[PDB]
Amino acid sequence: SVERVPVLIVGAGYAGLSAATLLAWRGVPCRLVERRASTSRLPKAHGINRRSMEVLRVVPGLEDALFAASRAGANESTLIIAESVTSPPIETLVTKISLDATPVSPSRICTAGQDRVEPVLLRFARENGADVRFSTTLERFSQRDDGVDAILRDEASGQETTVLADYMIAADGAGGTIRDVGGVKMEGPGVLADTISVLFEADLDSILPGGGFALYYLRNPAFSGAFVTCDEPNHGQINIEYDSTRDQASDFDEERCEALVRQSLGVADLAVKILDIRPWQMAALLADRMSFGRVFLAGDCAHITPPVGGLGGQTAIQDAADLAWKLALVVKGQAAPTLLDSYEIERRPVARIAIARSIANYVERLLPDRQDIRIREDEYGLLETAMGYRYRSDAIIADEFDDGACVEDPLRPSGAPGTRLAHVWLRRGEETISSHDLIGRDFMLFTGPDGGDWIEAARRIALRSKAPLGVCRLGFDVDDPEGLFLPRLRISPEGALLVRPDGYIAWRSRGRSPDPFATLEASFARVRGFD
Amino acid sequence: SVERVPVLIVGAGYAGLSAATLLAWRGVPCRLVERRASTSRLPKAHGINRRSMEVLRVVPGLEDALFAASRAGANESTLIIAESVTSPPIETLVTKISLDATPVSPSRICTAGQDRVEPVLLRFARENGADVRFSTTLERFSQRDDGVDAILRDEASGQETTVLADYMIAADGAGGTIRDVGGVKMEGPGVLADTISVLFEADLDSILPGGGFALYYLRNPAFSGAFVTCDEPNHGQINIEYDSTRDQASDFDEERCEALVRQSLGVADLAVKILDIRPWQMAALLADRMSFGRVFLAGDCAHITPPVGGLGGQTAIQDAADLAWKLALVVKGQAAPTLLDSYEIERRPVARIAIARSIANYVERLLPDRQDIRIREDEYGLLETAMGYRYRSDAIIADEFDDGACVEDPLRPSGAPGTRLAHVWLRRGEETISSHDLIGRDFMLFTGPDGGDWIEAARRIALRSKAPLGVCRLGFDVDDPEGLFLPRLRISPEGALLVRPDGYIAWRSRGRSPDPFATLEASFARVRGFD
Amino acid sequence: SVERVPVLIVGAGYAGLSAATLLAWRGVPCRLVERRASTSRLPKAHGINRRSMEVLRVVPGLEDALFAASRAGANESTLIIAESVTSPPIETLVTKISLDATPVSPSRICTAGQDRVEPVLLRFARENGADVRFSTTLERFSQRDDGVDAILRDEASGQETTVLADYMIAADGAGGTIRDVGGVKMEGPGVLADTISVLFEADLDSILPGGGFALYYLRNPAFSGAFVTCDEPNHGQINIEYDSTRDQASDFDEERCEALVRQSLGVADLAVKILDIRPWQMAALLADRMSFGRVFLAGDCAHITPPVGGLGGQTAIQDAADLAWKLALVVKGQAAPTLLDSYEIERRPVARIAIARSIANYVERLLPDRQDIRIREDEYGLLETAMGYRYRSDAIIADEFDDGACVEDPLRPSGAPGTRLAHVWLRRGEETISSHDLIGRDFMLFTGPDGGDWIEAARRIALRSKAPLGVCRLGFDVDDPEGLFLPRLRISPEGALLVRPDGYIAWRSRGRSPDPFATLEASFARVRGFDT
Ligand SMILES: Cc1cc2nc3c(=O)[nH]c(=O)nc-3n(C[C@H](O)[C@H](O)[C@H](O)COP(=O)(O)OP(=O)(O)OC[C@H]3O[C@@H](n4cnc5c(N)ncnc54)[C@H](O)[C@@H]3O)c2cc1C
Ligand SMILES: Cc1cc2nc3c(=O)[nH]c(=O)nc-3n(C[C@H](O)[C@H](O)[C@H](O)COP(=O)(O)OP(=O)(O)OC[C@H]3O[C@@H](n4cnc5c(N)ncnc54)[C@H](O)[C@@H]3O)c2cc1C
Ligand SMILES: Cc1cc2nc3c(=O)[nH]c(=O)nc-3n(C[C@H](O)[C@H](O)[C@H](O)COP(=O)(O)OP(=O)(O)OC[C@H]3O[C@@H](n4cnc5c(N)ncnc54)[C@H](O)[C@@H]3O)c2cc1C
Ligand SMILES: [Br-]
Ligand SMILES: [Br-]
Ligand SMILES: [Br-]
Ligand SMILES: [Br-]
Ligand SMILES: [Br-]
Ligand SMILES: [Br-]
Ligand SMILES: [Br-]
Ligand SMILES: [Br-]
Ligand SMILES: [Br-]
Ligand SMILES: [Br-]
Ligand SMILES: [Br-]
Ligand SMILES: [Br-]
Ligand SMILES: [Br-]
Ligand code: NA
């Protein structure tokens, strides 16, 4: 049996499920295959940061559903370093007060665990048309010049079928083997720590009186680890590091783990139900390339990060967001296949900074002595890393005076191409909407109120079906009373600003042009891979 | 037989009197000459911010005195934008509740005017041994090999005199011609507005509710300007911009200024007695050099900033305090004269951002239509600009992988070298002091409780070194009960932290060193100009 | 004794000042004479194209100075066809977006006009040792077997002077008479148009939007011409074609040119200050020969091109560069005089297509009505003409199966001997450089990573060959991560590539050689004019 599909996604985690929901929503028929039988697995990741939600909230209903699926609710997150969760805090890294005082995004922080997120993505992936098939395995594949030939295998029978796809998203995890087909090599420090993860049930309401969602980095003299509060109330997980020379994963039975749950919580005796025990590793590795022919590595198969910064799942989501909009343009013929060359160019350095940020969080919060393992070249600030990372590819018309910075303070936007369009409230009559509520579907061209020569130029381009472009004239379609949009992005009232479907600035004009149509038509062509 | 002096100061505004007050307190005999007969002139500036009060409070008694000389007192400051001082607010920028909600400093805001501040500074300069000669003018000068040959002149007789100085601080104001001797070119936007300042007396208690300090930025349809309250009660000041192509300075006689006072106040029946009228310019200019030879430019002669934000007089004070401690070391043989090369490389960027900040306050507050004059690359937060600027020079051992950040949030301190040592309520036994109460006089070495290797290295250093070095070990000399000092500065219990006499961090070690003496000795030598 | 100088250059335009700058930078003492008293003239040309900037950039500081002297800054060029400079464009041929999206060269487009470009060249010629004497004329000359003896004449006085010179670069412009001493015939269409050129001053700021360089081809119903922005702010220049039978050059007084400046600008009520009015012509003529004896014709004196392509000032520069590296070898005794026979062999066909390209642009852009003047036999693409021209001569060891093509697409390089070395971004350690940053001074030998046999041959050659030979290995000295250089030029890792001082490939071996010393020696010798 042989069927064809535009996009084939292998893997039903954060990367693959996001890729399918966004590719579905943007009108691209896809099929997702996943070896497991359901999303039902132990939670690993907790929380969706602001940028992850920005790329996901273009899908109607998705954001509220993610927040409804959470126990703690919006911005209700605390981060503490201590010797145990009942010990005096060594330091307090984040609170609801601190998240509320950083209005850098139309979205707040969502705290939901992976065990709650993956079903909601599956839900919206299917509602918008994705073909998600569980208990189905990519057995093997090869690439002809016009598509991928994939062999699929039913886990219940072993019966095989062939699917032909224009493109395939390898989303197959840290241990994923699709990349080996392409000879990609994971480079980096490698495995830095052996860990053992324990899921337990216990009276957590009393120990943690006023925290909705809590994460404690436990830095004590017996061991190092962390404790997280799960979405199921009175459920929690600890991830304790162990030395593979002094102990072994087999050595952690129910009796021993109940003591670890009590040591890490700072309680002498507490009734602890051990629900599951898992040995894991903490590694730092980056792929040398993130795509080969028509195969695209997304998520943990492209970049393994130390799970200390909580950046792994978010890079996976944003990886899958970058693929979704770009692939949706290529299969519709609104972009050249060359646009897909920009994927590892833009997304790989982002992964290099996450790995470095994550290593730095691990030293600073858990093992401050181990400064040798850090990559201080690539370290940047926490919000800059999650949210101010910059892109530089042929998918972007750089500013003439580009300083080459890897990040930009989201608090001090310059409006340079390659940066994430700033969040600013605007006015659409008596209602107020974020600038981000005006982007995310097609490209968008913002012009100042004197930007009518650009508007007409954009409307001649947007006449074409090949051309996915809309226009917004400031002071006509929406008003910026405070001057915090186009003035702060250094756009004069005769200027124009082009933003991608992922919300990143692609091109700007401080002011007027001798021929606005030719300027814009050439900008628009170039950034979609045409010449 | 010619009079000889270590430092000669020219001019007795904020810059010059600050320089003399601090130079004298630091044991340096100095002479300040000033053309005018006394301090008594009508005041332009109002207020001393928290950073300026921080460099001034190292002088015993000086901080209380300044607060005592003000009509309104600590944090009693209100900033409003409207169409007249009795029109409904258009915005509100600053309140006593806003400034009480920011415990960034050992000091609060002092609202005293120029006409109040300068006599107090004169008081303490002379008290600390400064030689302040009014009615005396620097007529001309020439730098020799071994000093500056100055020709002083008496305004009463025309009699002239020679003094030889090791160094000369040029504090001669926005128009000062000392800089023209050095080829100093002032660069920037230049004159931005023509203004007229009216000092008046009216029943201000009737139409102003609070009894504290009030500043109204005025956006009339007829004119833009500002109203301020003066320290003499029922005295106020309006600084109104005017178009030089439509009206000229001479056109503003008592009658017209009486009309302007009533317009800008909103009461068209109020009796107004015009005490002075003054034309003035609003300008933006920066010097290419802030030193040449043994001459140093401090205050308005080095940087003319628009007077919206009140940064011009605060920079002057802080220029002066930078000179006072570096000069004090160099004339004491305790630093190499190379240290003075750090004056303009540390101070000129601080003035660069203040010029950009004041332009931005001006546009945002008074002329939102003039977005084009802004210098947006150099604009930072209001509290970053006044207080979180950073210093990069050879007077500062920069921590490697420096990101080049021009400011740092005072609220989120990192302890990196070239930043202002954070304010933290420590405990000296039962006394509760500020971290700032332990700095200011000599170089200070803080260390963590396990940092005794540094301490003894420090003590052996100071035996030889010409410059003192104070030490203070945490948990011993002072106590940090809530880990908000050395921990938050990312200094381990075995680390150390070298703070300059101006309170800025010169060098840090996160932990131990294999030869702590050799690293401290090298550091301490390098941060005083030796190589 | 007589004043003796290695190369005498006559004329200080693009050709002559480029020859002087490059000769002096290559170590050749030379004398340039120019009849005029300073470089100060009216701006004619605008722009230095990418290829011209490659041959000029070898001289340290020169490229930065040319961009520094220009009002508009790199790639900030708009070409537009319209009825007036305020009419809606008929077609826009070029934008900065279009120019930035063509990474064919290390250099970008400099927009500086002739009045800016000529002082920069004179400055760099002199910094490098060139002897430039204004208010000096070549009065007459003759050739010997050992040089040209020249009579120089002072314009202030008419005092005359003899100088004997190994070689004489004839760079004396379209009107130049040096070629007539050689009996050089100019051949081709001849004069195609009479034109008048008006230099004016007007508030162009409040008319032109963008603040960069702009050239407008005017398809006005009343007339055909062109407006150009000048480097001096609020200065422009119009080149208006007039019918010599209906009007004559003397009929364009200040009142009429002010009218022209308003029509071709489209602004009815505009203040025009006429600064100069000049009648000119627009011709297409190619020289019989481009050298005779020790005299080499460089610049417009060897090829007059219609000024629509904008290739005449560019061909002059590249003429000069070709002569400069070749004379520099011959006068240093590092190359046989034979090498100079290749000058006109290689440069004349390049002028032939520049003329054909320029005629084709004048017709397409301004007068589409009469294609009868086109030389379609020699028309090629714009970038192919400017940049992808090919050299065939006894100075390039032609590979087997020569196609015969006059041009090659610079975007699809093949590595054939006789083509320009492709611009490839390479890595030297941490820094990223161009392949071109590695060429320009001496002959360069590129080998693959497994080409030590060539490098060893080359280092022993260089040890006693009169000319220097540099070597660079693609595994060691610089890195080519994306295999875009030697793989794409069809060179295996045991191959080598020989590149001339002008950057054109002279010889290639795709694999190993049975005697790598023998083949490299005979190749290095032949490409320098030595026989067998
Ligand atoms: C202890 C821990 C805590 C973490 N905490 C956080 C956190 O707080 N925040 C955060 O953002 N991130 C966190 N992370 C990281 C985050 O969980 C992962 O980065 C993220 O889930 C990776 O998603 P993915 O889609 O790349 O891969 P995966 O979740 O690995 O999914 C890949 C899927 O591929 C399937 N598959 C593989 N091969 C095939 C095949 N041939 N056919 C079919 N299916 C196949 C597998 O069955 C699997 O479901 C944490 C990680 C750990 C270990
Ligand atoms: C309307 C207005 C409002 C302002 N408001 C504020 C505010 O709220 N807050 C604030 O911080 N700043 C404010 N400023 C700015 C502030 O007043 C100045 O920046 C500050 O006074 C500069 O001090 P200075 O010592 O550099 O110079 P000046 O005050 O100009 O003093 C220099 C002195 O040098 C003397 N002098 C010059 N040449 C000689 C010579 N040859 N011999 C002897 N003496 C000489 C002069 O007589 C003069 O007194 C305001 C300015 C204006 C115009
Ligand atoms: C309207 C117009 C626009 C143009 N636009 C462009 C353009 O955009 N781009 C471009 O590349 N080209 C352009 N050109 C062409 C460009 O101007 C020429 O190709 C170039 O300037 C020729 O340089 P040259 O050195 O050959 O000659 P010339 O500029 O003619 O210099 C020759 C010199 O020789 C001197 N001379 C002559 N006889 C003697 C003697 N006996 N002794 C001493 N000195 C002597 C002359 O005084 C003269 O200065 C344009 C031309 C025109 C007319
Ligand atoms: Br975030
Ligand atoms: Br299913
Ligand atoms: Br709970
Ligand atoms: Br992670
Ligand atoms: Br706007
Ligand atoms: Br299109
Ligand atoms: Br002291
Ligand atoms: Br402050
Ligand atoms: Br003076
Ligand atoms: Br000020
Ligand atoms: Br401590
Ligand atoms: Br070109
Ligand atoms: Br031309
Ligand atoms: Na469209």
Author numbering:
A (entry chain B), B (entry chain A): 2 to 532
C (entry chain C): 2 to 533
Q: What sentences appear in the manuscript?
A:
Interestingly, MbnF is present in all methanobactin-biosynthesis operons known to produce MB with an N-terminal imidazolone/pyrazinedione group, but is absent in the three operons known to produce MB with an N-terminal oxazolone group, suggesting that MbnF is involved in the formation of the pyrazinedione/imidazolone group.
Diffraction data were collected at the Advanced Photon Source (APS). RdmE is 39% identical to MbnF over 96% of its length and superimposes with an r.m.s.d. of 3.2 Å. The two phosphate moieties of FAD are positioned at the N-terminal end of helix 2, implying that the dipole of the helix may contribute to the coordination of FAD. In all three monomers of the asymmetric unit, electron-density features interpreted as bromide ions are observed coordinated between the isoalloxazine ring of the FAD and the N-terminal end of helix 2. It is also of note that adjacent to the isoalloxazine ring is a channel that appears to be large enough to accommodate a peptide. Moreover, a nearly identical interface is observed between chain B and a symmetry-related copy of chain C: the A–A dimer and the B–C dimers superimpose with an r.m.s.d. of only 0.56 Å for 530 Cα pairs.
